Amino acid sequence: RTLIVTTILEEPYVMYRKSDKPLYGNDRFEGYCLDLLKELSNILGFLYDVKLVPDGKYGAQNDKGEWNGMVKELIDHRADLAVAPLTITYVREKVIDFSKPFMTLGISILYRKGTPIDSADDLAKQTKIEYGAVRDGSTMTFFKKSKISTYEKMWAFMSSRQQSALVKNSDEGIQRVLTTDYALLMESTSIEYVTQRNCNLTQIGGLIDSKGYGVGTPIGSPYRDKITIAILQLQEEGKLHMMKEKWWRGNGCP
Amino acid sequence: RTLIVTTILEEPYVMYRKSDKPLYGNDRFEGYCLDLLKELSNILGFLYDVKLVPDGKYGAQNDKGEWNGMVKELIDHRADLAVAPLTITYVREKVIDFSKPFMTLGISILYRKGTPIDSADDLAKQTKIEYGAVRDGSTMTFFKKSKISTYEKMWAFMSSRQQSALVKNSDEGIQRVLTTDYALLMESTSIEYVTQRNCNLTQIGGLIDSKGYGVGTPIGSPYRDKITIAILQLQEEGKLHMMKEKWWRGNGCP
Ligand SMILES: C=C(C)[C@H]1CN[C@H](C(=O)O)[C@H]1CC(=O)O
Ligand SMILES: C=C(C)[C@H]1CN[C@H](C(=O)O)[C@H]1CC(=O)O
Ligand SMILES: [Cl-]
Ligand SMILES: [Cl-]
Ligand SMILES: [Cl-]
Numbered sequence A, B: 001r002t003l004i005v006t007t008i009l010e011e012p013y014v015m016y017r018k019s020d021k022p023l024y025g026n027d028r029f030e031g032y033c034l035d036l037l038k039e040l041s042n043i044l045g046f047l048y049d050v051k052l053v054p055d056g057k058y059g060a061q062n063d064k065g066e067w068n069g070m071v072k073e074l075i076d077h078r079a080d081l082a083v084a085p086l087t088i089t090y091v092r093e094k095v096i097d098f099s100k101p102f103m104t105l106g107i108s109i110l111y112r113k114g115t116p117i118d119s120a121d122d123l124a125k126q127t128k129i130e131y132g133a134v135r136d137g138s139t140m141t142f143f144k145k146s147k148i149s150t151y152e153k154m155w156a157f158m159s160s161r162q163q164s165a166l167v168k169n170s171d172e173g174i175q176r177v178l179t180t181d182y183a184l185l186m187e188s189t190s191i192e193y194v195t196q197r198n199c200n201l202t203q204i205g206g207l208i209d210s211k212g213y214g215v216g217t218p219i220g221s222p223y224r225d226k227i228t229i230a231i232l233q234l235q236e237e238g239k240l241h242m243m244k245e246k247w248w249r250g251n252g253c254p
């Protein structure tokens, strides 16, 4: 039987394909994660239906501690796999079973080119430049939970004024960096994609932490360890590197 | 419960402590992996007994498909955990379980500063500068199995002439780089440790691949998932970063 795969639109992982006619089914989509799912299905021999997560969220807890997003789909057995840039975090790994990482990344800073700002510390010790993150994503959660001095300071700033420095999604954050005096705390793999495409933006500093994206499965899933092995195969054969180059390469920026 | 932990001496992961008198039991050792044990044991509650792997190997297969080293200890249920720089690989994942990674690295090149060599391709396209890897380690296995043309070329060279370009262990490789015209293919975290301590040596190029070290367990072990959760906790709190900095930082280079 066919596996149900929950996912979410996010460039260049999952995108609607361009066509002159309405699209249906898996043919609606392309991107890094679709290529990954193709290669996993060729190794393991499953068929799959891709289904966008109905609430359009990744996965976080409400005040009752109930989950939402892709994470909740897995928990409730409404999906067999989640294939998306879903960050492997302590809070999520308690409730679902992630494969080992297919991509390795960290939080970093997206900002304008040409400025004296060089680090998170540089941001934290001032108030003129605004800075934030996507609300309720793993980056925000990192700042909220940190007991490291600099990151707390930054959290105090981000959460101030009813979280006015936060944004609902990455595209809103990018447009805010492009238009106003604002820096976005963003996952490094997304910064790499953005800066290959808008030449006035750059990454500031290095990575603030280290983590991965993994395929999500419900706790107890027999597919988890099989997908880990298939990922390690694809990594060792250079295929994951090829897939990243295909989807990230931009040809217009210095 | 007291867990039995298999490990191997490897700087700065597991080292004999310095003392005026003979040392006994866990008190014989210090290093990044001993610190990681103390943190995992604090989180999860277990006691532990560290025992060096009797054959002094990590774990590779022979012709008959038989395993040795720490991997074979876990397969045979002679240890509960392997805590070491044990690379998470496709072949080992088929026979043991691993936690998610506590460190993320890739193969790169250790060579002398101030030469024209800038990449693996530079090494592959010539025969004058010798290059190789630790025999039967995961780096050697990477080259042996690769179908990427550059890496196939490299493997043909390393394996030529009775594997004269390979070395038995990392310290042998580092002495050969320091004395002769030789480059060592080495995991990037060990290169960082070496270059902090040998100011004439450097990493050449970037990482050739991406992989992690994980705690090994027998297949089916209930500790594997508990240790993963504990590692994610330590990562997000910045403790793994602090541990790396403690063991890696050297006295400075001119
Ligand atoms: C695109 C966003 C909302 C996702 C992607 N990975 C993170 C997650 O899985 O929580 C979120 C990004 C962030 O928090 O910077
Ligand atoms: C120190 C050595 C022999 C180990 C460490 N990790 C690799 C392993 O787990 O196979 C080996 C290194 C390498 O192959 O470059
Ligand atoms: Cl078409
Ligand atoms: Cl859908
Ligand atoms: Cl895992």
Ligand SMILES: [Cl-]
Residues within 6 Å of the ligand: B050, B051, B052
């Ligand atoms: Cl021992």
Ligand SMILES: [N+]
Residues within 6 Å of the ligand: A093, A094, A095, A096, A097, A098, A219, B225
């Ligand atoms: N899990």
Ligand SMILES: [N+]
Residues within 6 Å of the ligand: A225, B093, B094, B095, B096, B097, B098, B219
């Ligand atoms: N496994």
